[PDB]
């Protein structure tokens, strides 16, 4: 890698690892469209297995960017419209509170207060229907944003129904395979478990537990190389030869709602570039990121703005991830760690690196 990249990465990430006690970490810096890879530490502490460029990490909520793009691909196929009522795809959702709640609302967390998590007691299709049937909104749809797995998770599950494919099959055939993300998985096959890092929470090795709508909201595992290719694909959608996927990537970076200086895409979140670093750092703290905030609609949605900071944080019990990129600058970063450490530390480090290389 260019000396300037090696230098800023050492000076930023090695102290981050020291400060946060991260057992293993992989970073990709995309500079002038090309990825440069860095690894530290161990995927499995007890077995002394180092992190490599083939190590699989849990992406947590970065998975939502895949869901958003898969939804965009379905829009480009004409299979769904974001204005469609939720009940068009789940007619059994007869409760009156669902009148007026569209796929747009589900995808952008604006349905009216769907909860952060699907309750852990939901373990069957009947349980899932009862959960959504009995949920009572706190606000009218399209007025407040409340980040929620139960919202975009349902969007993903319904967006694939016209295709007749399961969510996993749709994701594999329509996103992973065309982009050659051949070491990206919703379910890690046995032959690949040898590459699956352990997450660490309070010193204990852990993997994410199964849960309702997990694939849609937080269940993807990937390598640093596949995640760099994911960033490249979102940086340069015109390089994607499948037209519906090219357009789906673009639609996930459209701006559908605004709150403060932040814009909501499909999975992705965006700010205008140049960005105020304190806003993205402070706004990444879960005290803000998970709070209800009023939103203003953007009608029609702003087509993807190249001068944007596009990003997403993600976590599981044992992992912490961050992706950010700037299309106009062909510049991005992926940070994958097997400890869930605070979001503002992730965003600060990412800013320091990309700011140094702009
Ligand atoms: Cl140093
Ligand atoms: Zn040093
Ligand atoms: Zn392989």
From Swiss-Prot:
Reactions listed under catalytic activity: a beta-lactam + H2O = a substituted beta-amino acid
Binding-site residues for a beta-lactam, renumbered to this chain: 61, 117, 147, 149, 315, 340
GO biological process, one term: response to antibiotic
Consequence of changing residue 295 to E: Increases activity about 100-fold with respect to cefotaxime. Reduces activity about 5-fold with respect to cephalothin. Reduces thermodynamic stability
Subcellular location: Periplasm
InterPro entries per UniProt: Bact_CellWall_Synth/Modif, Beta-lactam-related, Beta-lactam/transpept-like, Beta-lactam_class-C_AS
Record keyword Hydrolase present: yes
Resulting phenotype, residue 67 to I: Increases activity about 200-fold with respect to cefotaxime. Reduces activity about 8-fold with respect to cephalothin. Reduces thermodynamic stability
Result for mutant: residue 312 to A: Lowers activity more than 1000-fold
Activity regulation, per record: Inhibited by the beta-lactamase-blocking agents avibactam, enmetazobactam, relebactam, nacubactam, vaborbactam, taniborbactam, zidebactam, and beta-lactam-analog boronic acids, via a covalent binding to Ser-61. Inhibited by non-beta-lactam, benzo(b)thiophene-2-boronic acid (BZBTH2B) and various cyclic boronates. Not inhibited by clavulanic acid. Inhibited by O-aryloxycarbonyl hydroxamates, via cross-linking of the active site Ser-61 to Lys-312. Weakly inhibited by citric acid.
PROSITE patterns per the UniProt record, alphabetical: BETA_LACTAMASE_C (PS00336)
Residues at the catalytic site: 61
EC number per UniProt: 3.5.2.6
Molecular function per GO: beta-lactamase activity
Effect of residue 290 to A: Reduces binding affinity of inhibitor compound 3 about 30-fold
GO cellular component: a single term: outer membrane-bounded periplasmic space
Family: Belongs to the class-C beta-lactamase family.
Miscellaneous comment as given in the Swiss-Prot or TrEMBL entry: The class C beta-lactamase family has a specific amino-acid numbering system known as SANC, for structural alignment-based numbering of class C beta-lactamases, or else the simpler name structural position. A multiple sequence alignment was used to derive a consensus sequence and then the consensus was numbered taking into account insertions and deletions. This allows use of identical numbers, e.g. for active site residues, despite differences in protein length.
Main function: Class C beta-lactamase which confers resistance to penicillins and cephalosporins. Has benzylpenicillin- and cephaloridine-hydrolyzing activity. Has weak cefuroxime, cefotaxime, cefoxitin and oxacillin-hydrolyzing activities.
Subunit structure: Monomer.
Protein name: Beta-lactamase
Organism: Escherichia coli (strain K12)
């Amino acid at each position: 890698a260019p000396q300037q990249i090696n230098d800023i990465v050492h000076r930023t990430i090695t102290p981050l690892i020291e400060q946060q006690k991260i057992p293993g970490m992989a970073v990709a810096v995309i500079y002038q469209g090309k990825p440069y890879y860095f690894t530290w530490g161990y995927a499995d502490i007890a077995k002394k297995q180092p992190v490599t460029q083939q190590t699989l990490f849990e992406l947590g909520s970065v998975s939502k960017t895949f869901t958003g793009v898969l939804g965009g691909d379905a829009i480009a196929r004409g299979e769904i419209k974001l204005s469609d009522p939720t009940t068009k795809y789940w007619p059994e959702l007869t409760a009156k509170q669902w009148n007026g709640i569209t796929l747009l609302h589900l995808a952008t967390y604006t349905a009216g207060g769907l909860p952060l998590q699907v309750p852990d007691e939901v373990k069957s299709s009947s349980d899932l229907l009862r959960f959504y049937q009995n949920w009572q909104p706190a606000w009218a749809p399209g007025t407040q944003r409340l980040y929620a797995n139960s919202s975009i998770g349902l969007f993903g599950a319904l967006a694939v129904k016209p295709s007749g494919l399961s969510f996993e099959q749709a994701m594999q055939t329509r996103v992973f395979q065309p982009l050659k993300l051949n070491h990206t998985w919703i379910n890690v096959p046995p032959a690949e478990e040898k590459n699956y890092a352990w997450g660490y929470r309070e010193g204990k090795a852990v993997h994410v537990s199964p849960g309702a709508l997990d694939a849609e909201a937080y269940g993807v595992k990937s390598t640093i190389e596949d995640m760099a290719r994911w960033v490249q694909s979102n940086l340069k959608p015109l390089d994607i030869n499948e037209k519906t996927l090219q357009q789906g990537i673009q639609l996930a970076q459209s701006r559908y709602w605004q709150t403060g200086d932040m814009y909501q895409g499909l999975g992705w979140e965006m700010l205008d570039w140049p960005v105020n670093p304190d806003s993205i750092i402070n706004g990444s703290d879960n005290k803000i990121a998970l709070a209800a905030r009023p939103v203003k609609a953007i009608t029609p949605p702003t087509p993807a703005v190249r001068a944007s900071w596009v990003h997403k944080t993600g976590a599981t019990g044992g992992f912490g991830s961050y992706v950010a990129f700037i299309p106009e600058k062909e510049l991005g970063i992926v940070m994958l760690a097997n400890k869930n450490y605070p979001n503002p530390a992730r965003v600060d480090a990412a800013w320091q690196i990309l700011n140094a290389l702009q």
